[PDB]
Amino acid sequence: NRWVEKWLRVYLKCYINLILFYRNVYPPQSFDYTTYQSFNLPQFVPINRHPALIDYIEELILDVLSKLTHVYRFSICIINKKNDLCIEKYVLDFSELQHVDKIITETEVFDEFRSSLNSLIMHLEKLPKVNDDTITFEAVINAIELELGHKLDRNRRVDSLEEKAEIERDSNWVKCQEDPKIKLTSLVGSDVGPLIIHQFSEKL
Amino acid sequence: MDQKASYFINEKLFTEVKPVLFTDLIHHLKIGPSMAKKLMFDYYKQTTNAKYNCVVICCYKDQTIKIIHDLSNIPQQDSIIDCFIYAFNPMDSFIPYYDIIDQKDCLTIKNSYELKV
Amino acid sequence: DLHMDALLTKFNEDRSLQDENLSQPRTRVRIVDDNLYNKSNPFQLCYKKRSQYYHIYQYRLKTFRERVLKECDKRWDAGFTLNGQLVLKKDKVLDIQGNQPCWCVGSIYCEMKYKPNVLDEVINDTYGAPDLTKSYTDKESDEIMLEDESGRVLLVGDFIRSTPFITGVVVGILGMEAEAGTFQVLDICYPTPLPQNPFPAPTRGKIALVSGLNLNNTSPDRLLRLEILREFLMGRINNKIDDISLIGRLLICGNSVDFDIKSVNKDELMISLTEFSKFLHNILPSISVDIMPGTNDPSDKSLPQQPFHKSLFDKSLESYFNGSNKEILNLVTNPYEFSYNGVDVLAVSGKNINDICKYVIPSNDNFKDDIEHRLDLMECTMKWQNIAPTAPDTLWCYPYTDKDPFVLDKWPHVYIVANQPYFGTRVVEIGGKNIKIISVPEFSSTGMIILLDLETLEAETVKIDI
Amino acid sequence: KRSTTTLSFLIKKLKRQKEYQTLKTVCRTCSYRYTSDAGIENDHIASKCNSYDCPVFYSRVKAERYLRDNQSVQREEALISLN
Ligand code: SF4
């Protein structure tokens, strides 16, 4: 957790921004290609410049990093708005992540991130174009041993910003279930020492 | 060699998704630019399963270098002095990456001075 | 005329595959700088030493007046008669009164109002800037005076109209008073011609002129163009070593990185400098590199910008910065005079001409933002022997003491002004000497590089699409 | 060999210098009302204005004091690190 958090946050930011841009979740005019977005990105990743969207993405990534000790799968679901049905699912496996109980040069980490993001972009390019006008996205995680929404039964008298952040992050999730022609396409992840991440995608 | 180069290009194009340049062949096989361009052209053939985008550039007269985009209407075809394949792009946006390269023995032109330590 | 595959088959299948031994690579032509260690770099100042414009103005006025008086004495010497009568010498502006020709020396006074865009830019970043347009509209114009410490006279006529002028420039007006305190203009004298080094007749190589790299974290196409330039300079693309090996040196003339200094942090600038260092390390073993500070580069806002630093570069370049390896890498002051194989070339990043062009002058009725107008401005800069006519804009406090380096002391063989919107070359004959003026365009947009021959002084352009 | 602290030093110094240049340009443009001049002797006259009713004067004098401030020691530190 020394340098793992920063690289993981950068990778999550690149992943979310690429998925938003290439699936037309937000207008392409609001995205710009850049390498610095308060962190040196491994590539020229198109990052949205809407302040509310940036804050939302950063908060979600921080929450996921906080809960990383108990979550083994992070998914961004693409759901239509005419009906609440998921049409595309991108799964980011976290099978123990090779957690650093006790850390490697940044160059190889960025090279592996470049390979994984290039695989993701190559998969996304061949997908059919998605129309504008109310296509939206959704975030779902798969947990091992946790229970959220139950930390507000003691009146949670906050004292500092850390306690308020913990309370708001515990209460910002709801319980969901596991739920044809589902097509599974495995992608390229990172095989570096500290970070062992597997990438998946779903269609239909 | 048409075998090591093809294997390296296939690896760098499919195993680790990254655009491959002819300069990559120059640095890997320790060959001159002309041999690298010929090997790239050879790999362009025998490609019944085409799963990449070719980035081709041509050299005009008056020392002008252009990147072909339209691929249908190339202006001033009579003034072309050279045309080759610059890279194989597995994605749509080229956007390559550049790193530190040790040109110990792959240099075709060297400056008159030598690095003194 | 044919499909792309046909051209690829025609060109690639007939590859030469010759002369590429790769064990004995062709040696680049040797190009040296005679000013690497000689003495007294005029533009090398001390930042620690640090309004002082009064002394600079006095020195400039004295030197220019002395030179113009010498030229006038050479040209308008006693005994020179006009068509009707003899011309007299007048020391003060008030002595030119009569129906006889006469000449006097004084500074030129013009309006030179600021452009509205500059006014808006400075107003938006001051927090209390007044309506500066009122300063120009209250006066509500188009005239030129001649100030020589005794008054001013209006310079009417036609010879004075067809010449661009900047305030503070002294001249040798020779005319006739006609009907009022307005003085006609018939001939104009400039400072006496300066010495020039002899042309080194003789083999000889060329030098590449590139400026305006503008390495930004938002535009990746500029990185592609820089990589293509790196490949072309190494002979990987042209495949004609017999011509590539003649390019002795590469010259970057500023604007390596583009950023907003008002809102910037260390990380993104460090990323850009690491990219620049990667390019340098990948190009240094094949060719020598000379780097110049730019207007938007991380160097002093004034015009005499000192060399960058030994730092701000990757650790892979630490071998070149040990001090012994200066012929392959050299960081230099923004204005400099390279003695390339005896060919003295003066290089300016273009801040002076850019600062002159931000003024709207209600004069010179007989170009608007054209290459010809800027070329005429540069020619006037050589004529006036003043690199920076607009001292309050380009120059800073304490340029020097009693000897301003920006006043020319020796005309160079080749004059370079970089970071210009358009490219253009023009040779001018001033006092029997020949100076070549080169306008280097920006590389970020229309990324042309100028190949200057050191044996015949011909500038050929190389254009890279993307 | 240090590209972190020196880069911040240059960032601060260049921001200060550009702010000072903008203030001087504004003062020169305002003094054009009286001087009707653009070159030298206009900025010299503008530098002698001591109007207490305009914030630009306060900003200009603050910037001038800050240029002559301890930044001289900061420049010396940069010189030592560069060497
Ligand atoms: S008064 Fe305010 S505005 Fe007028 S010159 Fe002095 S500072 Fe500039």
Coordinates of all heavy atoms in Angstrom, one line a residue, chain C residues 128-130 132, chain D residues 23-31 45-60, ligand 1, unseen atoms left out:
Chain C
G128 N -7.8 45.2 -11.5 CA -7.9 46.6 -11.3 C -7.4 47.5 -12.4 O -7.2 48.7 -12.3
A129 N -7.1 46.8 -13.5 CA -6.7 47.6 -14.7 C -7.8 48.5 -15.2 O -8.9 48.0 -15.4 CB -6.2 46.6 -15.8
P130 N -7.5 49.7 -15.5 CA -8.6 50.6 -15.9 C -9.0 50.4 -17.4 O -8.5 49.5 -18.0 CB -8.0 52.0 -15.7 CG -6.7 51.8 -15.0 CD -6.3 50.5 -15.3
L132 N -8.2 50.9 -20.5 CA -7.1 51.5 -21.2 C -7.5 52.0 -22.6 O -6.7 52.8 -23.2 CB -6.0 50.4 -21.3 CG -5.4 49.9 -20.0 CD1 -4.4 48.8 -20.2 CD2 -4.8 51.1 -19.2
Chain D
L23 N 2.1 44.2 -14.9 CA 1.9 45.5 -14.2 C 2.6 46.7 -14.8 O 2.0 47.7 -15.0 CB 2.3 45.3 -12.7 CG 1.6 44.3 -11.9 CD1 2.1 44.2 -10.5 CD2 0.1 44.5 -11.9
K24 N 3.8 46.5 -15.3 CA 4.5 47.6 -15.9 C 3.9 47.9 -17.2 O 3.8 49.1 -17.6 CB 6.0 47.2 -16.2 CG 6.8 46.9 -14.9 CD 8.3 47.3 -15.1 CE 8.6 48.7 -14.6 NZ 10.0 48.9 -14.3
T25 N 3.4 47.0 -18.0 CA 2.7 47.3 -19.3 C 1.4 48.1 -19.0 O 1.1 49.0 -19.7 CB 2.4 46.0 -20.0 OG1 3.6 45.3 -20.3 CG2 1.7 46.3 -21.3
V26 N 0.7 47.7 -18.0 CA -0.6 48.4 -17.6 C -0.2 49.8 -17.2 O -0.9 50.8 -17.6 CB -1.3 47.7 -16.5 CG1 -2.5 48.5 -16.0 CG2 -1.9 46.3 -17.0
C27 N 0.8 50.0 -16.4 CA 1.2 51.3 -16.0 C 1.6 52.2 -17.2 O 1.3 53.4 -17.2 CB 2.3 51.3 -14.9 SG 1.8 50.5 -13.4
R28 N 2.4 51.6 -18.1 CA 2.8 52.4 -19.3 C 1.6 52.8 -20.1 O 1.5 53.9 -20.6 CB 3.8 51.5 -20.1 CG 4.4 52.2 -21.3 CD 5.3 51.3 -22.1 NE 6.3 50.7 -21.3 CZ 6.4 49.4 -21.0 NH1 5.4 48.5 -21.4 NH2 7.4 48.9 -20.3
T29 N 0.7 51.9 -20.3 CA -0.5 52.2 -21.1 C -1.3 53.3 -20.4 O -1.8 54.2 -21.1 CB -1.4 50.9 -21.3 OG1 -0.6 49.8 -21.6 CG2 -2.4 51.2 -22.4
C30 N -1.4 53.3 -19.1 CA -2.2 54.3 -18.4 C -1.4 55.7 -18.5 O -2.1 56.7 -18.6 CB -2.4 53.9 -17.0 SG -3.5 55.0 -16.1
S31 N -0.1 55.6 -18.4 CA 0.7 56.9 -18.5 C 0.7 57.4 -19.9 O 1.1 58.6 -20.1 CB 2.1 56.6 -17.9 OG 3.0 57.6 -18.4
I45 N 8.5 57.7 -16.8 CA 7.6 58.6 -16.2 C 6.5 57.8 -15.4 O 6.1 58.2 -14.3 CB 6.9 59.5 -17.3 CG1 7.9 60.6 -17.7 CG2 5.6 60.1 -16.8 CD1 7.4 61.4 -18.8
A46 N 6.1 56.7 -16.0 CA 5.1 55.9 -15.3 C 5.6 55.3 -14.0 O 4.8 55.1 -13.1 CB 4.6 54.7 -16.2
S47 N 6.9 55.0 -13.9 CA 7.5 54.5 -12.7 C 7.5 55.5 -11.5 O 7.7 55.1 -10.4 CB 8.9 54.0 -12.9 OG 9.7 55.1 -13.3
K48 N 7.3 56.8 -11.8 CA 7.3 57.9 -10.8 C 5.9 58.2 -10.3 O 5.7 59.2 -9.6 CB 7.9 59.1 -11.4 CG 9.4 59.0 -11.6 CD 10.0 60.3 -12.1 CE 9.6 60.6 -13.5 NZ 10.3 61.7 -14.1
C49 N 4.8 57.4 -10.7 CA 3.5 57.7 -10.3 C 3.3 57.0 -8.9 O 3.5 55.8 -8.8 CB 2.5 57.2 -11.3 SG 0.8 57.2 -10.7
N50 N 2.8 57.8 -8.0 CA 2.5 57.3 -6.6 C 1.1 57.5 -6.2 O 0.8 58.0 -5.1 CB 3.5 58.0 -5.6 CG 3.4 59.5 -5.7 OD1 3.0 60.1 -6.7 ND2 3.9 60.2 -4.6
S51 N 0.2 57.2 -7.1 CA -1.3 57.3 -6.8 C -1.7 56.3 -5.8 O -1.6 55.1 -6.1 CB -2.1 57.2 -8.1 OG -3.4 57.5 -7.8
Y52 N -2.2 56.7 -4.6 CA -2.7 55.8 -3.6 C -4.1 55.3 -3.8 O -4.6 54.5 -3.0 CB -2.5 56.4 -2.2 CG -1.1 56.6 -1.7 CD1 -0.4 57.8 -1.8 CD2 -0.4 55.5 -1.2 CE1 0.9 57.9 -1.4 CE2 0.9 55.6 -0.7 CZ 1.5 56.8 -0.8 OH 2.8 56.9 -0.4
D53 N -4.8 55.9 -4.8 CA -6.2 55.5 -5.0 C -6.4 54.4 -6.0 O -7.5 54.0 -6.3 CB -7.0 56.7 -5.5 CG -7.1 57.8 -4.5
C54 N -5.3 53.8 -6.6 CA -5.4 52.7 -7.5 C -4.7 51.5 -7.0 O -3.5 51.6 -6.6 CB -4.8 53.1 -8.9 SG -5.1 51.9 -10.2
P55 N -5.3 50.3 -7.0 CA -4.7 49.1 -6.5 C -3.5 48.7 -7.4 O -2.6 47.9 -6.9 CB -5.8 48.1 -6.6 CG -6.7 48.6 -7.6 CD -6.7 50.0 -7.5
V56 N -3.4 49.1 -8.6 CA -2.3 48.7 -9.5 C -1.0 49.3 -8.9 O 0.1 48.6 -9.0 CB -2.5 49.2 -10.9 CG1 -1.4 48.8 -11.8 CG2 -3.9 48.7 -11.4
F57 N -1.0 50.5 -8.3 CA 0.2 51.0 -7.7 C 0.7 50.1 -6.6 O 1.9 49.8 -6.5 CB 0.0 52.4 -7.2 CG 1.0 53.0 -6.3 CD1 2.3 53.3 -6.8 CD2 0.8 53.1 -5.0 CE1 3.2 53.8 -6.0 CE2 1.7 53.6 -4.1 CZ 3.0 54.0 -4.6
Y58 N -0.2 49.7 -5.7 CA 0.1 48.8 -4.6 C 0.7 47.5 -5.1 O 1.7 47.0 -4.6 CB -1.1 48.6 -3.7 CG -1.6 49.8 -3.0 CD1 -2.6 50.6 -3.6 CD2 -1.1 50.2 -1.8 CE1 -3.0 51.7 -3.0 CE2 -1.6 51.3 -1.1 CZ -2.5 52.1 -1.7 OH -3.0 53.2 -1.1
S59 N 0.0 46.9 -6.1 CA 0.5 45.6 -6.7 C 1.9 45.8 -7.3 O 2.8 44.9 -7.2 CB -0.5 45.1 -7.8 OG -0.3 45.8 -9.0
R60 N 2.1 46.9 -8.0 CA 3.4 47.2 -8.7 C 4.5 47.3 -7.6 O 5.6 46.7 -7.8 CB 3.4 48.4 -9.5 CG 4.7 49.0 -9.9 CD 4.6 49.9 -11.1 NE 3.7 51.0 -10.9 CZ 4.0 52.1 -10.2 NH1 5.2 52.3 -9.7 NH2 3.0 53.0 -10.1
Ligands
SF4_1 S1 -1.9 55.0 -11.3 FE1 -2.5 53.0 -11.2 S2 -2.7 52.9 -13.3 FE2 -2.2 54.9 -13.4 S3 -0.1 54.3 -13.6 FE3 0.1 54.4 -11.5 S4 -0.5 52.4 -11.4 FE4 -0.7 52.3 -13.5

